[PDB]
Amino acid sequence: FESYNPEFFLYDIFLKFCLKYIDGEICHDLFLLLGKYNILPYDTSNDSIYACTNIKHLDFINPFGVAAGFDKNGVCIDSILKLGFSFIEIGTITPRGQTGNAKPRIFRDVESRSIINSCGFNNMGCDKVTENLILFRKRQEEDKLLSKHIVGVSIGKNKDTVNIVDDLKYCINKIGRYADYIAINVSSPNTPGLRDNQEAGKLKNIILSVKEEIDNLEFLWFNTTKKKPLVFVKLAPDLNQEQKKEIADVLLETNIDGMIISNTTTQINDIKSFENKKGGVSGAKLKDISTKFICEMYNYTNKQIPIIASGGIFSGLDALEKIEAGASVCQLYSCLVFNGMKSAVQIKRELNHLLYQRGYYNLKEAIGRKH
Ligand SMILES: Cc1cc2nc3c(=O)[nH]c(=O)nc-3n(C[C@H](O)[C@H](O)[C@H](O)COP(=O)(O)O)c2cc1C
Ligand SMILES: CCCCCCCCOCCOCCOCCOCCOCCO
Ligand SMILES: CCCCCCCCOCCOCCOCCOCCOCCO
Ligand SMILES: C/C(O)=C(\C#N)C(=O)Nc1ccc(C(F)(F)F)cc1
Ligand SMILES: O=C(O)c1cc(=O)[nH]c(=O)[nH]1
């Protein structure tokens, strides 16, 4: 075993320990601290050119990135990317820093590889996170192994903010220049009233405001693409067909660059250890629900809006199911929690194998093949 490799057995011993004894958020923060101090293992393999993917000019070296919320403040972007991910969606930052809901607010259920959280948009604020992203961009600029890595920024509203657009615009003005794309978060179930912004009418206004604000912002782009950040919207899977269809029409009207399918769900209640817990559920129990959601939106949007998959992706098989359902790229969170540091290297290898086995010459060919 190569001790610098994410697959080094020692990291699995650590993973077992963490999962067995350590509080969810404490472990998470410890992990981010390890990454901040750059003492995490890293992937040294070269990514298959056959598994590269894209969403317009956004070129991902591999189809795996880490979902929003994992590095809410962008404290160790480099370290996380070097685990083998092609991109990371930092934050889900708010104009002002806020503490989030009362702890403990993150619980694991290993048997079902599920997580439930009621974090509440805890983050250091757009100002501080921008500084962290700026530091990364400068670092990315001197390093070359990160030149093609992508960083997206998830944005939301502060707990008391009346008009979400006011917060979105503030964040864009501050960090938009350093983002490869912006993720409009209107699907968190831990911020009262936030999900109402998924109503076709409101969502349309929000998306246009975000796009205009990005244009109004426009060496210029200190990001990877060297172009203005694309716009994605992250949706909750707890919507009825009518709602999804109306949203689908808005996404086409607003010509949104992409849609991150499925944030956590609130319709799961078959998990024993989560009965007395609040928040959104992530993990295996969310996979089918979110995959189906992808199928629907892919159809409802006539395969015109690129999809970033999120929800219960742990293996290459799970990723292929998301891909064949219409997803062009995948985001992981729970996988990192349950499979640990070897998450990226492992899932990439699995997907390459599976793509080969099934007879695909590349990953793109598989996108939507479940038609
Ligand atoms: C502790 C925790 C915090 C999260 N924070 C955010 C966030 O700030 N913004 C966001 O868009 N999603 C957030 N998510 C949702 C994940 O990005 C992802 O959509 C969801 O967990 C489904 O992926 P998974 O099944 O692979 O875990 C969070 C999830 C967890 C478990
Ligand atoms: C200090 C050494 C402790 C060793 C414990 C050995 C347990 C044997 O499991 C072997 C396979 O582990 C592979 C890595 O898995 C990491 C994630 O483990 C999930 C929980 O596993 C529970 C059983 O250990
Ligand atoms: C099912 C019961 C499992 C019990 C497991 C006991 C595990 C104790 O874990 C200690 C080993 O983890 C090593 C730490 O690696 C993570 C960070 O690496 C940074 C470098 O650290 C070197 C000093 O450890
Ligand atoms: C609930 C929870 O456990 C988390 C969250 N969020 C989390 O990041 N955990 C977590 C993060 C990293 C590891 C490892 F180091 F092993 F790779 C293990 C667990
Ligand atoms: O910060 C949070 O509570 C949060 C945000 C989000 O988008 N999803 C989630 O499950 N939690």
Side-chain angles (χ1 to χ4, degrees):
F1 295 64
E2 317 170 306
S3 49
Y4 59 77
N5 188 301
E7 290 186 292
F8 189 46
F9 79 87
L10 192 57
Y11 300 123
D12 286 329
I13 285 176
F14 184 61
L15 173 64
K16 287 184 185 304
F17 183 76
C18 305
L19 287 184
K20 182 73 171 301
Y21 303 107
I22 313 304
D23 161 77
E25 190 158 7
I26 289 178
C27 169
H28 184 70
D29 293 338
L30 169 57
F31 179 75
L32 295 175
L33 197 61
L34 295 182
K36 175 178 189 186
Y37 289 124
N38 191 52
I39 55 186
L40 283 181
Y42 43 91
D43 178 23
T44 55
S45 71
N46 295 294
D47 295 319
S48 168
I49 308 174
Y50 302 103
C52 77
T53 181
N54 73 296
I55 290 178
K56 284 178 163 176
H57 276 288
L58 214 51
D59 303 333
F60 304 87
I61 57 180
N62 73 59
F64 296 105
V66 321
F70 201 84
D71 193 353
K72 283 170 172 290
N73 305 307
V75 300
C76 63
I77 297 167
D78 323 62
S79 289
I80 293 173
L81 291 176
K82 283 175 296 185
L83 288 176
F85 300 94
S86 64
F87 74 107
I88 180 164
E89 183 174 300
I90 68 174
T92 239
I93 59 179
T94 50
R96 298 185 180 187
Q98 52 179 54
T99 57
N101 303 313
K103 299 183 174 187
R105 56 202 182 187
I106 309 181
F107 305 87
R108 302 184 299 270
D109 179 81
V110 192
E111 55 156 52
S112 76
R113 290 184 308 174
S114 299
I115 304 174
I116 187 175
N117 83 82
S118 53
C119 289
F121 278 178
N122 54 301
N123 67 291
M124 309 189 306
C126 182
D127 284 24
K128 188 54 162 52
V129 180
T130 290
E131 181 60 9
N132 285 345
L133 185 49
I134 287 173
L135 292 176
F136 171 74
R137 292 303 184 185
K138 292 189 174 182
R139 198 171 311 106
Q140 166 182 51
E141 185 166 45
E142 56 181 294
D143 190 351
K144 297 187 173 181
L145 299 177
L146 293 170
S147 73
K148 294 178 179 181
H149 285 260
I150 292 171
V151 176
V153 181
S154 177
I155 302 181
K157 66 185 290 295
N158 274 102
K159 175 65 179 306
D160 301 309
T161 295
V162 180
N163 177 45
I164 185 175
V165 177
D166 290 319
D167 283 4
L168 301 181
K169 65 178 183 184
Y170 179 85
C171 296
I172 291 177
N173 286 162
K174 287 288 184 178
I175 204 169
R177 185 188 166 218
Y178 316 100
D180 286 306
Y181 76 72
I182 298 293
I184 303 175
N185 192 339
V186 295
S187 45
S188 174
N190 304 142
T191 291
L194 184 60
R195 284 175 296 173
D196 291 327
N197 293 292
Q198 288 176 290
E199 292 173 49
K202 296 166 174 286
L203 182 63
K204 187 176 188 178
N205 180 61
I206 291 165
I207 291 169
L208 293 176
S209 297
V210 171
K211 298 169 65 67
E212 306 172 331
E213 180 55 78
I214 291 178
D215 296 325
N216 294 340
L217 177 64
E218 178 175 53
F219 71 80
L220 188 60
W221 302 106
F222 193 27
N223 54 24
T224 303
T225 296
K226 300 304 172 186
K227 296 189 64 180
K228 66 180 179 177
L230 297 191
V231 180
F232 301 157
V233 62
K234 186 163 183 175
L235 306 173
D238 310 322
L239 298 170
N240 60 50
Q241 299 309 311
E242 175 51 36
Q243 298 181 293
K244 297 174 186 181
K245 287 177 179 177
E246 295 182 54
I247 292 177
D249 288 322
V250 171
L251 310 184
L252 284 174
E253 302 172 8
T254 61
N255 189 46
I256 198 174
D257 302 290
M259 60 196 299
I260 306 172
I261 299 310
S262 188
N263 194 310
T264 53
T265 175
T266 304
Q267 63 182 290
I268 293 182
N269 302 298
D270 61 314
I271 300 181
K272 306 169 186 172
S273 60
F274 293 172
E275 300 189 312
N276 67 310
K277 303 299 195 306
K278 297 181 174 184
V281 174
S282 306
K285 310 299 296 309
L286 169 71
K287 195 177 66 66
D288 298 327
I289 291 174
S290 59
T291 294
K292 188 181 185 187
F293 191 8
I294 291 176
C295 287
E296 309 169 322
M297 295 309 288
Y298 190 58
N299 287 324
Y300 296 163
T301 60
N302 322 303
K303 314 175 186 174
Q304 297 305 296
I305 301 178
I307 294 177
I308 291 79
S310 178
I313 306 179
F314 293 83
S315 61
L317 179 55
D318 298 338
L320 188 56
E321 306 183 329
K322 300 294 185 181
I323 292 172
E324 302 188 314
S328 190
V329 285
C330 301
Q331 296 189 319
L332 312 180
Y333 190 117
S334 293
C335 179
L336 216 37
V337 173
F338 298 106
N339 286 321
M341 298 179 231
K342 69 184 177 301
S343 285
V345 306
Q346 198 157 79
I347 194 157
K348 287 187 298 184
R349 175 184 298 116
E350 292 177 355
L351 184 62
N352 289 334
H353 283 181
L354 193 57
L355 286 173
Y356 182 81
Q357 289 177 53
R358 300 304 180 69
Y360 285 105
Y361 48 74
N362 62 39
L363 181 153
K364 293 169 186 178
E365 186 197 341
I367 304 176
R369 180 149 143 178
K370 185 174 182 291
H371 59 299

